[PDB]
């Protein structure tokens, strides 16, 4: 019986293991058979659409969508009830403009995959309305629980009769839909942009969940037009989900999960306990140095905190050291996570920039050096006057014993950066071979990997990439109005009246990004601020290579910054102790992070040197 509750998700899992299969065969076979099984590399791209949008249906059903909450903390019991209702109703409007635009996509297209002599291309676009019909039933069910829990004013039946009538008016008399434009009342011209951006930011801060809020912003521009937008964005929308580097995101998240859930962190810890710990300050040295390996295990900043936390707290506790110092170092451990492959937010920036993950990761490892080294120096700087006790001696017998038994796992980061660094493998297959590698050693060198665990891990990974899928798609609709109406030149007129240097804009934009980083969480803010500021940066002739590592580095300061910074709360959650302990614990660690930010801000040559030497 229990499977009946999530069958479309388990179909998603059965697709996903088909992906994992197709590509493990592909990459090894490509080399060894010395000619490409080309069908495989393209079939993969289709399959990803479906699992991507099944992921949206999960994030829909669970109501796990990304949003800004600040007003909810401010707001009374009633005013909530209204705004919750008003918001969720506005989302019920979203999904109909989605399905309408879905059907008005479909009969407009007749283009096969001629790279494989054309088999059933229409299947991509057809995915959107069929899975959106599942989203319709799932969404109404979810809001019924919201009303049963008193969050809202309205019953299911309201939305149902609404669905009924909206189809019926298209089925028989859509001239009365042609009446619903604002165009009988307006004179905006170019000023439409500044309106559309105002109402956008308002509905966003009203706490409309981010993807749907962007869909509302983008349809609200339709009201200003006399023209084409109906075709132009619509075809772009789901077909943009097709893009290849995004397929790496699922496998990297899966790799994080499997590697963490195998308990391998304690073995990398006990390796560091010998290799670095015999230098005094060892608690810090192991956390700081091993974080390059841990980030290579974990694939996201929260997974470093959630995985390592018990070990590093226990090590400091057994040493008798201070809990605020523990909080500080472990926050900085999570900042290392974004520097290193795997890293979701980096990869999302790659997608939204449309730039290759190769030329980004081989750049990102330079701030990998600078942050870890300066953090190591700050550990020494504090310690040599703080007066902590000196660490134990070591000898080769225990150290190499610990090395052998760990050694099979130690390759994990050295696989993913190494394959890209040497140029033998590109981003997608590096993620997939890492997934393969972590499973196969974990099956036979270790034993905790259950037969079920791959599917259990897959459903989390695919579910999280659901959130990503909505957010990418919706952002790329925003990539109609911006390129249509040239926000770049109007925002440029403000700056351009005086604007002289890259340093000027870089620090001003970093200040805005930091300021919003105080107040909107990173996993939202990334999608808020990239879409238009990347263009503005390009209008000031900035290298989008630099701007990616710079702005993703701002996100890390953001997650490190109160009041919003969620990683501070994650550290508090594992630390069992107050945010007042956390804040003074983190307080000095920001200084080397800001120095290293400023060092790259003033001198591009650092990030340039490795990528441009190897790649040029």
């Amino acid at each position, epitope marked *: 019986m229990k499977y009946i509750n999530k069958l479309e998700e388990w179909l998603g899992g059965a697709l996903f293991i088909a992906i994992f299969g197709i590509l493990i065969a592909q990459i090894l076979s490509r080399q060894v058979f010395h000619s490409p099984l080309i069908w495989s590399e*393209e079939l993969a*791209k289709l399959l990803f659409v479906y699992v991507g949008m099944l992921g949206i249906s999960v994030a829909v059903r669970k109501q796990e969508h990304v949003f800004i909450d600040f007003l909810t903390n401010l707001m009374p019991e009633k005013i909530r009830k209204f705004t919750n209702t008003f918001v969720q109703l506005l989302v019920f409007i979203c999904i109909f403009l989605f399905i309408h635009f879905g059907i008005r996509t479909f009969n407009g*297209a007749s*283009f096969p*995959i*001629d*790279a494989l002599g054309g088999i059933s*291309e229409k299947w*991509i676009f057809a995915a959107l309305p069929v899975v959106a019909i599942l989203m319709m039933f799932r969404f109404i069910q979810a809001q019924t629980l919201n009303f049963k829990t008193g969050k809202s004013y309205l019953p299911a039946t309201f939305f149902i009769i609404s669905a009924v009538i909206l189809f019926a008016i298209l089925f028989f008399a859509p001239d009365w839909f042609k009446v619903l434009r604002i165009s009988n009342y307006i004179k905006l011209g170019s000023s439409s942009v500044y309106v559309a951006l105002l109402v956008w930011l308002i509905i966003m801060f009203i706490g409309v969940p981010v993807g749907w809020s962007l869909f509302i912003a983008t349809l609200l521009y339709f009201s200003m037009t006399r023209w084409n937008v109906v075709n*132009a964005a619509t*075809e*772009k929308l789901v*077909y*943009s989900l*097709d*893009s*290849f*580097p995004l397929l790496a995101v699922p496998f990297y998240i899966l790799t994080g999960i499997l590697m963490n859930t195998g308990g391998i962190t304690e073995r990398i810890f006990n390796f560091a306990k010998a290799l670095l710990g015999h230098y005094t300050g060892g608690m810090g040295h192991v956390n700081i140095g091993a974080s390059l390996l841990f980030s290579g295990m974990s694939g996201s900043a929260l997974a470093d905190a959630g995985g390592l936390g018990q070990l590093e707290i226990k090590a400091m506790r057994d040493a008798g050291y201070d809990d605020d110092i523990c909080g500080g170092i472990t926050a900085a451990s999570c900042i290392i996570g974004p520097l290193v492959p795997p890293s979701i937010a980096m990869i999302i920036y790659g*997608v939204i920039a*449309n*730039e*290759s993950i190769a030329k980004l990761f081989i750049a990102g490892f330079i701030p990998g050096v600078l942050i870890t080294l300066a953090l190591m120096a700050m550990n020494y700087r504090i310690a040599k006057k703080r007066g902590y006790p000196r660490t134990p001696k070591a000898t080769r017998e225990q150290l190499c014993s610990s090395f052998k038994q760990s050694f099979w796992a130690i390759l994990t980061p050295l696989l993913i950066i190494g394959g890209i660094f040497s140029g033998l493998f590109s981003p997608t297959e590096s993620a997939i071979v890492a997934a393969a590698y972590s499973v196969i050693i974990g099956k036979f060198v270790y034993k905790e990997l259950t037969l079920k665990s791959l599917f259990n891990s897959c459903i989390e990974a695919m579910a999280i990439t659901g959130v990503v899928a909505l957010m990418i798609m919706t952002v*790329t609709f925003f*990539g109609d109005m911006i*390129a249509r109406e040239q926000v770049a030149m109007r925002v440029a007129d403000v700056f351009v009246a005086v604007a002289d240097s890259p340093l000027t804009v870089l620090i001003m934009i970093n200040a805005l990004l930091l300021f919003l980083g105080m107040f909107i969480d990173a996993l939202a803010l990334q999608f808020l601020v990239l879409p238009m500021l990347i263009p503005i940066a*390009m*209008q000031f*002739n900035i290298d*989008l290579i630099f701007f990616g590592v710079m702005t993703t580095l701002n996100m890390m300061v953001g997650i490190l910054t109160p009041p919003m910074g969620m990683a501070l709360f994650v550290v508090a959650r594992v630390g069992n102790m107050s945010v007042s302990t956390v804040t003074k614990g983190v307080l000095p660690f920001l200084i080397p992070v800001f120095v290293t930010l400023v060092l790259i801000t003033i001198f591009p040559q650092i990030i340039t040197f490795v990528p441009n030497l190897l790649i*040029p």
Partner: nanobody
Amino acid sequence: YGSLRLSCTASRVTLDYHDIGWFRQAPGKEREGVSYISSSGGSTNYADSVKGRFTISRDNAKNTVYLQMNSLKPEDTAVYYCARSSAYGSSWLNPSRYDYWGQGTQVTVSS
């Protein structure tokens, strides 16, 4: 026989994401094209209605791409574009023109 060249000039923007493309359009239309050029391999794709005497060249590092056109027959005549078709796998021509375009240019030959 004679053959004009047209070129895309990476002005300002990134122009090496591992795709680029080119198009021309009629009176009453915006859905017509040549199909992909690859940064790597020297790979070149065309549609069969296009197969024949249209030709391809690139440099990444002075970011400069040029098309050259040998037909000189009236059906060649249109308004013309280079377009930063980027990151969409399936199609030779569909609106996969994700990030950018030139405002189009005019070229003409007749008896």
